[PDB]
Symmetry: C3
Subunit: 624 residues, 3 copies
């Protein structure tokens, strides 16, 4: 039992009492909130040639707060914010696993108790760090996680629920030993860059205090790590031979600036087929997968050597050069708002829909105290269809990535959404083509569609993703020199070291999500990434402003119409029908929804004026 003091807060870490069967287990308590995290890793290598790691964060201690009816129904009971928390924990611990650790691993977080004051999400990240540190699962170094808020100008570590309601910043920092950064997740209320950077500095300092506390617990316990029967990394002598066979062929492909996404991939795969052939007879005893990963190591190394040595990219861009950006608005007449944003070979179509404020809400499956009500009556739905990458996939449900990307784009656009808007705003972003940051293009395209729909947003929001290529020595593991890339392609994200997605208006920052694939990066690189992204964001906003610079003076004339109709007490029963039958039928046949305002007035909402006059005669016949 170790206590770590974080300012006025206290973090208690325990182990050895609950779930002694699991490979690692820990209980993290802050105030009267306790989170229990376990880690399990199979000793038999998985058939798949990657690291299968699943993180699941649940609130099963309340039985989901209700009684879901069926097994299939239970596949939806998992809350949205529980999926988002699992994604944050996953990105905090994934980079620290050893390379070639192809073993099925599961990290489970169980909310023992919640006091409604201390947020359990930050405790879950620390619990995952302690559980892996105390387990025999090889995992490099503990990580500490804190949430930084800005309340009336002060910087608060791990703010309570009440403090978060008055904070202009919601930043979560995961830090590795010697002040490295492994995860960043922020949601700011259009705050200045300097204020944002200072909060990262304060947060990283606090995570180091957690790391030394966890390190004290590890020494007291006496953790011993397992020896995996095989770490699946290509032997250096086969990688070296692959380098000889494909160095020049791969270099020519990557220095050819005429390639597009498909042409470059076909060119690389054409080399892969030729090299993987001769590699087989030279090394007959090599594993079939080992040959594939040997080529992927060489192709990645050649790709990184070009940008490091020559300060040029595979499509001829310089380090700070954007892709071609084109925008359109109002492409379909019947949509309330529409925009088509293209960034290189990434294409996103954004739609805006309006609805009643009281629409939704009456859903009965409120497993928590969670219903259709959002903070500003604003939500963003993100969809990534399989044809965006010329792929085949089922369209049943939203996977974790689509739900995570939608929340990120929603965070980016949230601070500029107005209050007291008469309608519920829903923005739908559909990725038609994907070669880059469709997540950030949903913020730019969503911004354009919001102005095109006539929503009076305070400012336009643009996002961009910053990549990173580093040179790291094998004797120390320190970063010697590095390059930051503006508006990375898909191959630069795949062969890079991070996907630093950051969005905001022309004067401030609204959202950030850093997905670092390295085992930590210095704070210096993070500060420069925010600055480099600031210049790119201004350039994107200038292109967007040419297409549309301000919201339209009014909504489209073919949009929703809201007004009241009177029904006296005498004719109330016939109008609503037996048990509200007539109103329910009207909502079924036509989209018109009728709600009771006062004892004698009903508010009629019609999604289109065409659907309005259709239901106008329906209430006329009822009124007889």
């Amino acid at each position: 039992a170790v206590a770590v003091d974080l300012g006025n807060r206290k973090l208690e870490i325990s182990s050895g009492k609950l779930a002694r069967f699991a490979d690692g287990s820990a209980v993290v308590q802050s105030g009267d909130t306790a989170v229990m995290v376990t880690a399990v890793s199979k000793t038999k290598p998985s058939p798949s040639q990657f690291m299968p790691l699943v993180v699941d964060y649940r609130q099963k201690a309340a039985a989901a707060g209700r009684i879901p009816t069926n097994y299939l129904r239970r596949e939806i009971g998992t809350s949205d914010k529980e999926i988002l928390t699992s994604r944050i924990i996953d990105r905090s611990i994934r980079p620290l696993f050893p390379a070639g650790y192809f073993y099925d691993t599961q990290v489970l977080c169980n909310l023992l108790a919640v006091d409604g004051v201390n947020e359990p999400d930050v405790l879950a990240i620390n619990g995952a760090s302690v559980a892996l540190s105390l387990s025999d699962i090889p995992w490099n170094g503990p990580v500490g996680a804190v949430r930084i808020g800005i309340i009336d100008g002060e910087y608060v570590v791990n703010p309570t629920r009440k403090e978060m309601s008055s904070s202009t910043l919601n930043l979560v920092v995961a830090g590795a030993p010697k002040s490295q950064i492994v995860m960043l997740e922020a949601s700011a209320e259009n705050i200045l860059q300097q204020d944002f950077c200072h909060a990262i500095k304060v947060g990283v300092k606090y995570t180091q205090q957690i790391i030394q506390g966890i390190q004290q617990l590890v020494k007291e316990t006496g953790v011993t790590k397992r020896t995996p029967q095989k770490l699946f990394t290509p032997s250096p002598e086969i990688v070296k031979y692959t380098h000889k066979l494909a160095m020049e062929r791969l270099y020519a492909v990557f220095t050819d600036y005429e390639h597009d996404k498909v042409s470059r991939d076909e060119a690389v795969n054409k080399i892969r087929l030729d090299t993987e052939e001769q590699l087989k007879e030279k090394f007959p005893e090599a594993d079939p997968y080992e040959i594939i990963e040997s080529f992927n190591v060489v192709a990645k190394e050649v790709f990184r050597s070009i940008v490091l040595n020559e300060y040029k990219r595979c499509d001829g861009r310089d380090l700070t050069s954007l892709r071609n950006v084109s925008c359109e608005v109002d492409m379909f007449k019947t949509l309330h708002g529409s925009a088509l944003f293209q960034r290189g070979q990434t294409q996103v179509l954004c739609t805006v829909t309006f609805d009643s404020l009281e629409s939704g809400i009456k859903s009965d499956q409120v497993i928590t105290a969670i219903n259709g009500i959002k903070d500003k009556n604003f939500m963003l739905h993100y969809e990534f269809p399989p044809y965006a990458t010329n792929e085949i996939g089922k369209v049943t449900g939203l996977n974790r990535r689509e739900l995570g990307h939608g929340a990120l784009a929603e965070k980016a656009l949230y601070p500029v959404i107005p209050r007291d808007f008469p309608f519920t705003i829903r923005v739908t972003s559909e990725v038609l083509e994907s070669n880059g940051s469709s997540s950030m293009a949903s913020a730019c395209g969503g911004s354009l569609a919001l102005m095109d729909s006539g929503v009076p947003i305070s400012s336009a929001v643009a996002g961009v993703a910053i990549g990173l290529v580093t040179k790291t020595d094998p004797e120390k593991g320190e970063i010697e020199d590095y390059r930051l890339l503006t508006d990375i392609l898909g191959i630069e994200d795949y062969n890079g070291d991070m996907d630093f997605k950051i969005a905001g208006t022309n004067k401030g920052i609204t959202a950030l999500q850093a997905d670092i694939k390295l085992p930590g990066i210095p704070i210096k690189i993070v500060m420069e990434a925010i600055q480099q992204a600031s210049v790119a964001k201004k350039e994107i906003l200038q292109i967007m402003n040419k297409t549309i610079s301000k919201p339209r003076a009014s909504r489209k004339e073919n949009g929703p119409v809201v007004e009241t109709v009177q029904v006296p007490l005498s004719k109330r029963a016939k109008f609503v029908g037996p048990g509200g039958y007539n109103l329910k039928k009207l909502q079924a046949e036509t989209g018109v929804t009728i709600s009771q305002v006062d004892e004698e007035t009903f508010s009629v909402f019609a999604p289109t004026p065409s659907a309005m006059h259709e239901a106008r005669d329906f209430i006329t016949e009822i009124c007889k």
Copy 2:
């Protein structure tokens, strides 16, 4: 961009703007309704031994200007209107793929915008044809699709929603080049055969104009088809050796009229086990699947040659003979209505249940999944349990075929269902045994169970399936000769060319679904099939009328009751409970349904008099 004038309608076809990574893509716009269809096909052969083709038509709510109304504010699950549209598109495009194209293929439809006037389902069929035509996927000639309705005695091409509500016919025709027919899907208000037949030729004439426009677009934008890695068809020399090995044994099996479904299958499989083992010895280097497919081709060729050369079928019937038909009603006392319909070895049990009117409108927002309404308060649920074929399979969820068969049998019976029936009519049809058209037996047994239940349907409805065996010219590809079969078995559907399911009253046609396996058939074959099924339908109605010829004068004594109760204002609070809690508790432990029709009076629906007795007991004791 190509424009097609379909009478007073307009069709706009475009490509090359949206979703450029997909193998094929197209946008089809009529009026203000736009649909985007993409087609993706893998270049690597599928592990399965067939063509996996999936069509997923999505009715996204953003296109219609509505926000999903559950607590997640996002659409969950698949609606039954989307499944039916996916089946029509699948029926229109599947026959045109080359034989042996064992590659994973997905066609996706995205509703860009809908104006509430032009129906997007027909546009999605044309969009799938354009996307496949412009892609590199090997696909035969373009397909044009139109909807024909009869409004005030006039034929209208692609009627709007307003005209579709007043039409007596809803026919969808998909045509191939040279006026062939690849898909027919109609529901009619018991219209005459002549009027139905004229609409098919009017529709086919319009689909040729669409094909003309699509071919112009294909010419303008160059299309080069891919060369598949290989086409999985059995070698002609291997097939000819199988014929010399099993033609005589297979001929004896199919001329043995004492067989039933199971014994004939055992006899055929007995020949297959002897022949395939000899085939492996003769062709050791042949593909294991090539052996299986070569026998299937030889068995199909022998089976069809008997019908063509001798006009006699495998069970001894001639081309127009029905199977044995047996009907029975009043199976169980507690059922509101029931019927057991036997057609050869196909056995169907149909049940009628009278539900409350309120349960008909499940469209209310309470559903976390999707739900809607039915025009008349009539619906049919069709079950195909695994034991109907003596096999083991999943029984819970998501069987598109069950949904398609239920919708077909439902629209067959819909025209005769009375209006203003005081209850919701739910018909459940379970296939206890299947050796043929259980979907049409569901229509026959559904009408028997409806008359037995006491529903005053206007006329009895019977359905039948018409098969087809053709002798196609090997080179030219036209039909040299053909035979039409009445009331086909399962084997004649599987080894045939079409499953022409058509139902109707003795004086008209109510439903039609033609499942053509050929790459198009002439209109003269369709016309003869409709006439041949007219003769069979009268014969079936003659047998069914012997069991029961008119609806029973009243519903069964154990049927549902509706009557109102009176509660005073003082006892209203105790009766209803806090937030209507005591009401929801009463209808959950009794099965009744209580609705408030006035301040003082409540209406009570009970499925049985015993259920009403218990509810009456609770009402009086709560009132005192």
Copy 3:
């Protein structure tokens, strides 16, 4: 075709009319309720290397066939009441399949008609027996099943729905020929042990009459059984050889009382891996599964020989001794009630949550009917996370076992739950570690957490699982001798003959579920198990009473409260908002629920007193 008379009740069994394509089909009718059951078994050996058997009891309507629900199955799925019936049917027919019958098999139930009087669940068990009896599937003698209830002191066979509502016992007995018991599943209102044992005697007598009727129907029909392509049982030559290489090593492992669950399994695996290589060399033609299965048979027989010959379990205790029991309550300040029950290496954490009574109903007429309404506003939720056994598994949703264990533990605690409690009571049992009866530990821990939470239960409830090791000669199958084990581990459950779970207070029995793996056991063995478990249950209640002996004087001061607020007619519209937006906005902000009770009265339920302060701020702000 055959009629079986059970007292004042009648059972009509028929076949040969419906679903003639299935391998076996039967219709069982009692009164005006008819159930059709089919049985299909593939002739191709499945690659699963075990017996794939799935039973799907599907009903067409809820509320005793009064609210249709079958059309919703594509979107909603299968209700839990259908899963529980499918498990009862599965337990009755699974042990009678021959060993090595590795063929995919499905039993499907179709409620052709229900009258709202006779329960179709009992008919489905009989129908599954008749369908398998008339089929060509190799399956042992017919199984009869009845339900026994106690109404005003008398014993009633197959009681109607009205009778079951006034019964103090709900016992389902599935009997094999020669008065063997195959399945036992009961829930009682804390009835005496003597009354419980007599009902089992009455039930087995009735199941023998049903078996006579089925045997008559089989003879008339003329059933001939298929010959399966192969029966996957290890050859005696290789089973004997495995006994030669691994008997002494396995004997030492099972006589080492210093082992725990993990270490004992590792030691057996060490012998197994060493034995597999020797077996493969000695029998190169042997199938890979045959090598594996021979070791499992030899290890199982060595394990049982120690209990039979030496009367000592693998962890050193005698046949009656319990494992170490440790209880702990009130571990987290914010939980309404909590308890951590430890029994050997099994650890369960139980939590009590008070919710509003309004949360009981789903407010959708059909969906509320599907899952029903818990009678005392009490439910138990059982979770078996994958880390409880140091494995990785799917997390969302509950498997069949989790639903069954939750229903069993809720039945055990139901009789002591008080009536007219102001709040809905939800108990969550989470298995942190598993080495034995976590389902019965959920009953003990749930009782501790309920007294800790301040719920005035009538008495504490404890459960236990009784094992069985028998020695039967292969010729006849009768039981020469047997040992009954108290509080079995996982290895003794796995290598044993039954998992006899029974729970109750110190003066009665509230729940029972017997999972017999033999093809029936004598009734005298069952009666000894009940008595032996009553002594063990006494020892557990003595330990639990030391931790907490009576419910706390009142609920925790941070628990939920319910109070009323008066809003006038003039302020009603503003308070609720147009379309009830304000009430649901307050619910989404603070978690409180406001329900209108009269014209002026609104009842507010708040999870915490602080949450009610936030709600009260809104109420006065509007007014």
